[PDB]
């Protein structure tokens, strides 16, 4: 029941790419890195929990051992997808050439096929790419580029698709898989054994499950079973034997064609690599059981193999494998030493061990003797240990002659000691063994240059520690062994290697053993304590390392402090000046003890050793008196810095001792601060350290002042003249400043303000002057890196300062100028990094990392109350980078190009993890720095940016970086997303990348993070694609579309199963591909429509009305945003369907899942302002200096919805953490409040987005529902929209920041949809409910037609107008509608009319006036007001509408242009006069006289008046005259016509020109003109009978009319000659024009 | 065959906001309905007054 189904997926899934094989490379990466997301991912978690994987990792040979499994291979390869032929052929060829099982070859070939794209991308650049990177570099200056013999990319691809290169890649993948499998098992071992505590919960569960299942190692038992874990050592030792055999013989069945120099080197390196990793596994297995022995048979076999291979030296003879030789030699020597465990060996034989088997003893002796006689140095430690063992054995038997006896007598060592003494002497002579031990320790240490990980390093150091332990007593105190042990413990570390990280308790044994076991503590620890200060190195390095190694150990946290404050012994050289201050005791001659007779004042409160103190002259003197050595060292440093000599004092500190002292002080201060800020530690520990260091010194000067004066004195001169020792002293002083920065920033900043190193206005700057072509070797690179890191920490402390007192003696100006000058210096360093000659690329890597990180922080806080604190430095940097001159641009970009090249040219390695981590760190830092710079350039508005082109040209390197390492995937695509986003506001991409390069990058990107299925990587790549579509990269998108489409569709098949975070991004990209590229996707959409529509229905009908009540209360934002995206997706497709005319059914089906949006979509109900208000209250009352709005993000980056959105939690975390209680207890406090508030506003933003998405959606749906049928659905729709507007327009209570658009779009949607239905004529008669509330809404606004709210007022009045229209289309009578309509129309018309007149007294205003008139008529036409005419008249009389209208129609005239205002005024009056009551009031107000005395009438009197006249004046005059008088004439004659007939006749006779002209051209609104004129004349003719005084003469020649109209009566064709309507003609205007003609003809007959 | 025709009549502009033009057309239709209704309303009132004396 242990199958390979999980270890390797089915063939079709492998080839299609649906599922990626979990190769050993990715497993080894995830294990070495211990990445939580990776290891705990479903795929890799299941892979690790597979019993079959367990079995093979237990038996490593099975992976590549040659067994006859034709059956399996044929069954897996058969019956599936074309292409299986080549895969099967290559697999069989590999199985036969390498002589392995067929399944292994098959999976190797599948790995190669899947990584085809990576392999093509990693190959060297082509000619086009080379030219692009050259153009990016520039002409002005050492790029160290690749040769130009590279062929064109086309030829490279055509060679890549051949069989030879495919087979070479398959062999490379096989070798890489060997290496990676061994490395993965090693990493798994050390992850199970010595994982650090505090590990994540799921990761700890995975570790425990692995242990229990694969090893029966259940921690749930007091003593778990370790058998299956100890079984590893011998299996992997046999494997190492097999590997050393392989390294000497190449595959036989392979052809010499494949056997090339490169392949031979690859094979040998692979063998050495798997040997190293197997040895690491074995050493861990043997390290688990520290105190017990190992079996003697295994030791015999191992040492026999050693003798045969000279401890792996037979394969490490070549030079190209030295990088793998030093590590392997260290590890094999250490595992031999381990097997011996001399401590317990020599403990046993004086008090089954391998000593009881003379066979094993003979094996060990012959192996050691051969390795010694040969003469290689890697065997010296083992030989020395064995020599000591044999020495003790010799003593043991010599004390018996008065099984190991058999061995001693076989080797004739019974009665002579010189055979072993010779080996011992040669091992210890000249410190050879000690020097190689130091080297092994360096490669096995915690530094970044170590070959193995830190943990393996600590255990490997333990073995050598035990060797030195038991050898200490028999060899006197010497420089070689003490320095060897110092190198063992320190491992060449520095101040920056200090940290409070909690590692496995087992891993600090190498350090605690110094104070736990007796031998070491007594012989070396106490000895160095005794020799200090005479020997400064022994004690200095010890304290420096232990203070850092005991940071987290609480029991031993006080030993360093007690030694420094309370040292029992002291040792110093004797100055003749003290010859008169002592006297011998005369007890023993050799003891040479003595006693002081005076007060010896060293440096002659001061440092004095009192009188009568004991001492001894060993060769120098030692006094055993209790005192504080810390104050002593502080005073010595003070003295040597002041250059004050003291003849009667002790010897001064030399340059080397000075540097070491400063370094130790800095390190101890850092450690004290670190464990003081830790929970429970005395917070005043660093201050007490500073005080005790300032004790017995000048009253007001402190150790900090000592360091300051030292720096000043040594920077007096320039840097290049200073020698190595002084440069190291300066580096130590900078490290001390960095250490002190945490506890006393004020002092450090106050000093930096006037430091010469930093550039200033007074002097240019010494640090700025050491730029050039000098070599950055250790002496100077230490100083440089220390300065850069101090500057970075300074920037950090400046950005993390929200506000006896830490910040004393400094001010805003100090911070600002220091930051500006620090930025200048960092820029100078970043520039000079190009030409400098570093000791190695790792130093360059570290330096570039640090400086780029500093500048990146500066850019980050560039991004506003306390931004000014460091804004000038950020401005300087961004200006230097975004708009520099050409030479400047090239020299500023060169480091980035070099970084990319180094990134993807450096080969991948399973060892030296520190180097790889630092290189990846600098890579990611430069990528994120470029990204932030592009964001800043896009935001601030600088368009011409050179970095743009430099990156577009370097895309050749960016697209290939992900192929070299997967960790670069995320930052690379963030940077490229930004690169195309800043440019979208067009550039070419393939022109730089290339056809083949772009296609390979496409395929590598395809199937986002398929092995691990992570969220962040997925999100980044999908947002990358979406932005790619949104910045109009029209070509690359079109190319990549052709199975990423199917990938997205399959991702969306089960949205409920996948996370919401994943979904929002994927569907954002789907929207971005649909909106911008509709035709390509709509076909594919048709293809997947059934499935996709199903899923969308589900998600949209989930309709969680109360998100916050349901479990997903904080996940409401992602829910709302994905809902909005679904809406935006379906909307545009249904609109295209409308255009396609096949929507009648699709809309009817879609309308059934809109309930979610109906309930709370248009409404933005859920804001809960109260919470934001209380948050503001708290932050404001607790912090007077800073206010709530000071944390508003500036949209510097593309604002990301998530844990932090409106408020920048990222920076608050560090700024507001300085104060206690911010975090609180049990996740209660202000941080929680900010999180909840920014989430509420996140979903509020998504809510506004949904408002817009639904504004889109509903419209084309309503338009697709125009057909008569299914009236219930559209009734529901209009009902719901009026409801949403009703409850949203009022009590909105929003922020008045982004609400401006809502206020208008709401009314827009309302009026649009209501008019759409009005066109359908299917609205109900009862609209009074909404009418009352809309009147209330119009009354709510505070200023009518205010400048700010004018658009809103216009739209609301339009809504009221259309609602009145709909209302009067009803039969209320065969709360009442009448009174409501009356009151609302009264108020609105009166107020608006008179206020508009007021302002327009002296364009928007007359347009709104026309609308007001329209509203007046629309409400007058209501069936229910004809019976209340009296009330309309009453309230139109209360307000003097009549008078103001009559006043302003004659607004402005000249006296013997066009009347617009007059037109509208008399239109208003006519519509008031529509019914006879107001008409009678106008008739009784002498309106006729008022308009006749006005000069608009004078203009009407002239002869140029015409319907289609030449000037707008005359046309306006025709229209106004006709409208204003003629219908008004008949309306007023309706009431008491007999009385006012005189006035109508007089106004008609006053202007005869129009009367004549009209009838002449009748011999088109002239129709209604003559209609009204004929009616008026015909009625007044009859009225004329009673009185001749009234209507004296008609003066109308209507005789022509009965002939004119009759000529156009019967001509259908003739009738459409001179008809031109101002309004749209559209079934014909004829239909009604001829109707008017008919109406007029009859009456006058 | 329909996809090819739609491609042949494809406007080279943003296809997302093609309904904003329709919303503006709906505003123009609002204006047209205003004109229609007011015109016909007081024309019908004039016809009423015409039949009254007639």
From Swiss-Prot, chain A:
Keywords annotated in UniProt: Membrane, mRNA transport, Nuclear pore complex, Nucleus, Protein transport, Translocation, Transport
Keyword field contains Protein transport: yes
GO terms of molecular function: structural constituent of nuclear pore
Functional summary from the UniProt entry: Functions as a component of the nuclear pore complex (NPC). NPC components, collectively referred to as nucleoporins (NUPs), can play the role of both NPC structural components and of docking or interaction partners for transiently associated nuclear transport factors. NUP188 probably plays an important role in NPC assembly and organization.
Family note: Belongs to the Nup188 family.
Complexes and interactors: Component of the nuclear pore complex (NPC). NPC constitutes the exclusive means of nucleocytoplasmic transport. NPCs allow the passive diffusion of ions and small molecules and the active, nuclear transport receptor-mediated bidirectional transport of macromolecules such as proteins, RNAs, ribonucleoparticles (RNPs), and ribosomal subunits across the nuclear envelope. Due to its 8-fold rotational symmetry, all subunits are present with 8 copies or multiples thereof. Part of a tetrameric NUP188-NUP170-NIC96-NUP53 module.
Protein name (record): Nucleoporin NUP188
Source organism of the structure: Chaetomium thermophilum (strain DSM 1495 / CBS 144.50 / IMI 039719) (Thermochaetoides thermophila)
From Swiss-Prot, chain B:
Subcellular location: Nucleus, Nuclear pore complex; Nucleus membrane
Primary role: Functions as a component of the nuclear pore complex (NPC). NPC components, collectively referred to as nucleoporins (NUPs), can play the role of both NPC structural components and of docking or interaction partners for transiently associated nuclear transport factors. NIC96, which is localized to the core of the NPC and the distal ring of the nuclear basket, is required for de novo assembly of NPCs.
Family: Belongs to the nucleoporin interacting component (NIC) family.
Quaternary context: Component of the nuclear pore complex (NPC). NPC constitutes the exclusive means of nucleocytoplasmic transport. NPCs allow the passive diffusion of ions and small molecules and the active, nuclear transport receptor-mediated bidirectional transport of macromolecules such as proteins, RNAs, ribonucleoparticles (RNPs), and ribosomal subunits across the nuclear envelope. Due to its 8-fold rotational symmetry, all subunits are present with 8 copies or multiples thereof. Part of a tetrameric NUP192-NUP170-NIC96-NUP53 or NUP188-NUP170-NIC96-NUP53 module.
Protein name according to UniProt: Nucleoporin NIC96
Source species: Chaetomium thermophilum (strain DSM 1495 / CBS 144.50 / IMI 039719) (Thermochaetoides thermophila)
Full-protein residues shown: 246 to 299 of 1112
């Amino acid at each position: 029941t242990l199958t390979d189904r999980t270890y390797l997926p089915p063939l079709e899934d492998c080839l299609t790419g649906r599922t990626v094989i979990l190769s050993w490379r990715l497993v080894a990466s995830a294990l070495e890195d211990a990445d939580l997301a990776r290891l705990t991912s479903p795929a890799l978690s299941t892979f690790l929990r597979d019993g079959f994987v367990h079995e093979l990792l237990k038996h490593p040979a099975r992976v590549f051992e040659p067994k006859d499994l034709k059956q399996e291979f044929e069954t897996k390869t058969s019956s599936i997808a074309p292409g299986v032929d080549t895969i099967k052929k290559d697999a069989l060829w590999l199985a036969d050439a390498v002589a392995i099982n067929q399944v292994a070859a098959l999976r190797i070939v599948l790995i190669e096929y899947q990584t085809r794209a990576h392999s093509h991308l990693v190959l060297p650049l082509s000619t086009q790419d080379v030219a692009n990177i050259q153009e990016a570099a520039g002409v002005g200056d050492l790029s160290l580029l690749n040769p130009a013999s590279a062929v064109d990319a086309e030829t490279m691809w055509c060679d890549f698709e051949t069989e030879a290169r495919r087979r070479e890649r398959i062999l490379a993948t096989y070798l890489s898989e060997r290496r990676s499998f061994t490395a993965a098992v090693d990493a798994l071992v050390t992850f199970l054994l010595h994982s650090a505590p505090g590990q994540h919960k799921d990761l700890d569960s995975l570790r425990r499950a692995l242990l229990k299942d694969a090893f029966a190692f259940d921690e749930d038992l007091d003593v778990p079973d370790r058998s299956k874990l100890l079984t590893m050592a011998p299996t992997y030792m046999n494997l190492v034997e097999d590997c050393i055999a392989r390294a000497q013989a190449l595959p036989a069945k392979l052809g010499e064609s494949f056997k090339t120099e490169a392949f031979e080197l690859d094979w040998l390196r692979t063998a050495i690599t798997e040997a190293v990793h197997s040895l690491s596994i074995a050493f861990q297995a043997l390290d688990l059981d520290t105190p017990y022995f190992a079996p003697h048979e295994l030791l015999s076999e191992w040492f026999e193999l050693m003798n045969s291979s000279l401890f792996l030296e037979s394969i490490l003879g070549f030079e190209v494998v030295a990088d793998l030789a030093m590590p392997a030699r260290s590890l094999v020597s250490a595992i031999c030493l381990k097997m011996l465990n001399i401590d317990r060996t020599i403990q046993f034989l004086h008090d089954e061990p391998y000593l009881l088997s003379s066979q094993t003893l003979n094996k060990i002796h012959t192996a050691v003797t051969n390795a010694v006689n040969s003469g290689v140095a890697a065997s010296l430690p083992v030989a020395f240990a064995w020599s000591l063992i044999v020495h003790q054995m010799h003593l043991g038997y010599q004390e018996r002659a008065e099984p190991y006896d058999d061995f001693l007598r076989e080797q004739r060592l019974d009665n002579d000691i010189a055979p072993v003494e010779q080996i011992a002497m040669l091992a210890t002579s000249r410190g050879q063994v000690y020097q190689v031990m130091s080297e092994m320790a360096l490669c096995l240490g915690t530094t970044h240059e170590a070959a193995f990980r830190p943990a393996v390093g600590a255990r490997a150091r333990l073995v050598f520690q035990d060797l030195l332990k038991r050898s200490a007593y028999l060899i006197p105190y010497q420089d070689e062994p003490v320095f060897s042990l110092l190198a063992i413990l320190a491992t060449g570390r520095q101040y920056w290697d200090v940290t409070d990280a909690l590692s496995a308790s087992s891993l600090n044994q190498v350090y605690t053993d110094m104070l736990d076991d007796e031998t070491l503590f007594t012989q070396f620890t106490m000895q160095a304590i005794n020799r200090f200060p005479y020997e400064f190195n022994p004690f200095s390095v010890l304290c420096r390392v232990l203070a850092a190694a005991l940071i987290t150990n609480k029991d031993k946290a006080d030993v360093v402090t007690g030694w420094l404050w309370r040292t029992p012994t002291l040792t110093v050289d004797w100055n003749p000046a003290w010859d008169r201050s002592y006297e011998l005791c005369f007890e023993d001659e050799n003891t040479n003890s003595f006693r002081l007779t005076r007060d010896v004042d060293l440096f002659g409160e001061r440092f004095i050793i009192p009188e009568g103190t004991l001492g001894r002259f060993v060769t120098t003197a030692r006094l055993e008196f209790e005192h504080s050595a810390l104050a002593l060292l502080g005073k010595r440093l003070e003295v040597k810095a002041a250059e004050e000599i003291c003849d009667s004092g002790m010897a001064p500190l030399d340059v080397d001792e000075q540097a070491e002292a400063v370094a130790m002080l800095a390190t101890v201060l850092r450690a004290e601060s670190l464990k003081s800020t830790a929970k429970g530690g005395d917070p005043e520990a660093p201050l007490k350290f500073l005080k005790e260091a300032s004790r017995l010194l000048p009253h007001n000067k402190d150790i900090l002042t000592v360091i300051s004066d030292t720096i000043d004195g040594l920077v007096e001169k320039e840097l290049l003249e200073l020698d190595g020792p002084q440069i190291a002293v300066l580096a130590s002083c900078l490290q001390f400043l960095h250490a002190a920065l945490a506890v006393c920033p004020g002092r450090v900043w106050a000093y930096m303000s006037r430091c010469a190193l930093i550039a200033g206005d007074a002097r240019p700057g010494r640090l700025s002057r050491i730029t050039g072509s000098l070599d950055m070797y250790a002496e100077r690179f230490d100083l440089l890196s220390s300065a850069v890191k101090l500057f970075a920490a300074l920037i950090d402390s400046a950005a993390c300062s929200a506000v006896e007192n830490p910040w004393l003696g400094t001010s805003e100006k100090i911070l600002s100028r220091v930051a500006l000058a620090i930025a200048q210096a960092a820029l100078d360093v970043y520039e000079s990094t190009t030409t400098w000659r570093f000791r190695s690329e790792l130093d360059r890597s570290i330096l570039v990392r640090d400086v780029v990180g500093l500048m990146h922080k500066l850019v980050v806080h560039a991004h506003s109350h306390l931004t000014s604190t460091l804004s000038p430095a950020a401005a300087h940097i961004i200006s230097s980078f975004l708009t520099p001159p050409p030479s400047a641009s090239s020299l500023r970009f060169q480091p980035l190009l070099g970084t990319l090249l180094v990134a993807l040219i450096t080969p991948r390695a399973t060892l030296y993890p520190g180097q790889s981590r630092i290189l990846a760190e600098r890579v990611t830092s430069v990528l994120a720095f470029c990204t932030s710079l592009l964001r800043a350039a896009d935001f601030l508005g600088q368009t011409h940016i050179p970095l743009q082109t430099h990156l577009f040209q370097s895309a050749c390197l960016l697209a290939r970086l992900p192929a070299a390492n997967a960790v670069y995937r995320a930052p690379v695509l963030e940077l490229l997303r930004a690169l195309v986003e800043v440019a979208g506001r067009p550039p070419s991409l393939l022109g730089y990348l290339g056809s083949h390069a772009a296609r390979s990058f496409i395929s590598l990107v395809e199937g986002i993070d398929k092995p691990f299925g992570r969220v962040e990587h997925a999100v980044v790549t999908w947002r990358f694609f979406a932005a790619v579509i949104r910045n109009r990269q029209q070509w690359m998108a079109g190319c990549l579309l052709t199975s990423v489409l199917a990938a997205a569709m399959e991702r969306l098949r089960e949205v409920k199963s996948l996370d919401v975070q994943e979904a929002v991004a994927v569907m954002d990209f789907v929207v971005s591909a649909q909106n911008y590229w509709p035709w390509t996707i709509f076909a594919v959409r048709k293809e997947k429509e059934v499935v996709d529509a199903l899923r969308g229905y589900v998600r949209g009908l989930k309709a969680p009305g109360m998100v916050m009540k349901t479990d997903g209360a904080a996940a409401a934002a992602f829910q709302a945003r994905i809902a909005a995206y679904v809406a935006e997706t379906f909307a545009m497709q249904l609109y295209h369907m409308r255009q396609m005319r096949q929507a009648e059914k699709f809309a009817g089906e879609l309308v059934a899942d809109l309930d979610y949006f109906l309930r709370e979509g248009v409404m933005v109900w859920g804001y809960n302002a109260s919470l934001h208000g209380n948050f503001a209250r708290n932050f404001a009352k607790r912090f007077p200096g800073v206010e709530v709005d000071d944390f508003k993000r500036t949209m510097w980056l593309p604002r990301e919805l998530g844990k932090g959105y409106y408020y920048a939690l990222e920076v608050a975390e560090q700024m507001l953490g300085f104060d206690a209680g911010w975090g609180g207890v049990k996740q209660s406090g202000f941080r929680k409040e900010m999180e909840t508030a920014n989430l509420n506003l996140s979903l509020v933003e998504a809510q506004v987005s949904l408002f817009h998405a639904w504004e889109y959606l509903l419209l084309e749906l309503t338009l697709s529902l125009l057909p008569k049928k299914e009236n219930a659905a559209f009734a529901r729709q209009v009902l719901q929209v009026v409801e949403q507007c009703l409850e949203a327009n009022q009590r909105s209570q929003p922020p008045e920041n982004i609400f401006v658009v809502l206020g208008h779009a709401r009314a827009g949607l309302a009026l649009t949809l209501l008019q759409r239905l009005a066109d359908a004529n299917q609205l109900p008669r009862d609209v009074t409910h909404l009418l009352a509330l809309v009147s209330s809404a119009i009354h709510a606004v505070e200023n009518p037609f205010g400048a700010n709210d004018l658009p809103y007022f216009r739209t609301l009045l339009k809504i009221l107008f259309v609602v009145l229209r709909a209302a009067k289309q009803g039969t209320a009578k065969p709360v009442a509608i009448t009174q409501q309509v009356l009151t609302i129309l009264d108020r609105v018309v009166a107020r608006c009319f008179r206020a508009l007149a007021a302002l327009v007294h002296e364009t928007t205003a007359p347009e709104d006036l026309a609308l007001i008139t329209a509203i007046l008529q629309a409400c007058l036409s209501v069936p229910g007001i004809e019976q209340c005419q009296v009330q309309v008249l009453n309230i139109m009389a209360a307000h003097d509408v009549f008078q103001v209208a009559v006043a302003l129609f004659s607004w402005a005239d000249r006296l013997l242009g066009d009347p617009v205002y007059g037109e509208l005024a008399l239109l208003f009056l006519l519509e008031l006069s529509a019914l006879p009551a107001l008409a009678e009031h106008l008739a009784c107000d002498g309106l006729l006289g008022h308009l006749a005395a006005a000069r608009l009438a004078g203009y009407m009197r002239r002869t140029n008046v015409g319907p289609f006249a030449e000037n707008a004046g005359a046309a306006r005059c025709y229209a106004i005259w006709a409208k204003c008088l003629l219908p008004l004439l008949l309306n007023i004659l309706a009431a008491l016509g007999s009385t006012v007939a005189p006035e109508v006749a007089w106004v008609l006779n006053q202007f005869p020109n129009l009367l004549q002209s009209s009838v002449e051209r009748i011999e088109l609104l002239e129709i209604s003109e003559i209609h009204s004129l004929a009616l008026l004349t015909r009625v007044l003719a009859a009225c004329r009978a009673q009185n001749a005084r009234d209507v004296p003469e008609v003066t109308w020649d209507g005789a022509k009319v009965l002939e004119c109209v009759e000529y156009w009566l019967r001509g259908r064709k003739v009738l459409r000659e001179r008809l031109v309507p101002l309004g749209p003609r559209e079934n014909r205007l004829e239909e009604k024009a001829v109707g008017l003609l008919v109406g007029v003809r009859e009456v006058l007959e | 065959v329909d996809v090819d025709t739609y491609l042949s009549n494809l406007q080279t502009k943003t296809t997302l906001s093609m309904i904003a033009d329709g919303l503006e057309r709906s505003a123009r239709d609002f204006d047209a309905f205003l004109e229609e209704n007011v015109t016909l309303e007081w024309e019908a009132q004039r016809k009423r007054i015409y039949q009254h004396f007639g």
